[PDB]
Design a protein around this ligand. Sequence first.
Ligand SMILES: O=[N+]([O-])c1ccc(O[C@@H]2OC[C@@H](O)[C@H](O[C@@H]3OC[C@@H](O[C@@H]4OC[C@@H](O)[C@H](O)[C@H]4O)[C@H](O)[C@H]3O)[C@H]2F)cc1[N+](=O)[O-]
Ligand SMILES: *[C@H]1OC[C@@H](O)[C@H](O[C@@H]2OC[C@@H](O)[C@H](O[C@@H]3OC[C@@H](O)[C@H](O)[C@H]3O)[C@H]2O)[C@H]1F
Length: 324
Amino acid sequence: LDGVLVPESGILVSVGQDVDSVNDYASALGTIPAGVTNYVGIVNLDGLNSDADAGAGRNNIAELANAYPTSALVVGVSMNGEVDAVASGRYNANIDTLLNTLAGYDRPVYLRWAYEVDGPWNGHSPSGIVTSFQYVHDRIIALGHQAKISLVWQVASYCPTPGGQLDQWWPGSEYVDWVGLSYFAPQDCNWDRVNEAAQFARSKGKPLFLNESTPQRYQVADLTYSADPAKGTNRQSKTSQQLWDEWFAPYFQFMSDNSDIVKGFTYINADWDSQWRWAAPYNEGYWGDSRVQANALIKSNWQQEIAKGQYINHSETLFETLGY
Ligand SMILES: O=[N+]([O-])c1ccc(O[C@@H]2OC[C@@H](O)[C@H](O[C@@H]3OC[C@@H](O[C@@H]4OC[C@@H](O)[C@H](O)[C@H]4O)[C@H](O)[C@H]3O)[C@H]2F)cc1[N+](=O)[O-]
Ligand SMILES: *[C@H]1OC[C@@H](O)[C@H](O[C@@H]2OC[C@@H](O)[C@H](O[C@@H]3OC[C@@H](O)[C@H](O)[C@H]3O)[C@H]2O)[C@H]1F
């Protein structure tokens, strides 16, 4: 796809990853985000045309798209543990409806198909990922939606999964418009996973989207950090400048260090602790509170950074800038 829906220059600023947290961000920052992010499952299309709230914030792409009619949509599509049945065609009617629905919004859509392709917890087979990316990239063309829907192959870039295993998941450059990654606690392995994902994207000639990012294990309102990924115990006080310097400055530095390929990010701005999947007593890891508006210094510094001219923010020229 040769730069289609990929900005020639600049980094798309998007926010996620549930309707309410995105509305709260837009309210608190007094801004219309350039891109907004939700999730849907392919088995039920849960979250596409009506509310789906399963403990990770409310998803409703119809509501989101009406609330932000001149912002890009970013959509994570879960395989719901069924990628092999998806690859064998059992959900093909649902795929068409998903693609036709998203194309009916007449705006740039970034589709993270089977996001975190190499996260073992997603139950994926390499075959099912390679086949289904082929099928979906081709179906976008068959349905006539290739000017509108950009297909993102997003890895998990998660330190406990060993490096050097990305090739088995790759469907081929002809079937991928962007590579994506997750930027949470890359310091746990010296940035090795996120750097490996970036260098993979670079080697394939694809732009890079940081599709999931948050100061994982930090609390912005409380100003704390924990080294405990499972339960968030023995929380450490941080100053707000420390929390900026420890997570936010390196996050933006990573984008500069990879500025040949980085063309978008999604910042997840949420009180994760308020959402039951991510809440105490932490059955699915410790996440924290990533709301930049919950600290004045973090909020100022955030707004000051993303207003800079390497970032693509919302304006009347946004869709043109993104290649729509
Ligand atoms: O301490 N940690 O390092 C830690 C511990 C756990 C943890 O949990 C995961 O958090 C990220 C979240 O994205 C994962 O969510 C799983 O996604 C897969 C789901 O699969 C469903 O399982 C039920 C099945 O019937 C259905 O077919 C299938 O789709 C699963 O439900 C989710 O739990 C968590 F697993 C993260 C971390 N860490 O962050 O620190
Ligand atoms: C990347 O790391 C951070 C996690 O928060 C992300 O997990 C996704 O968070 C948002 C949830 O809405 C999504 O949950 C899926 O939503 C669609 C449902 O059909 C599906 O059952 C549900 O798991 C999380 O995967 C992670 F990607």
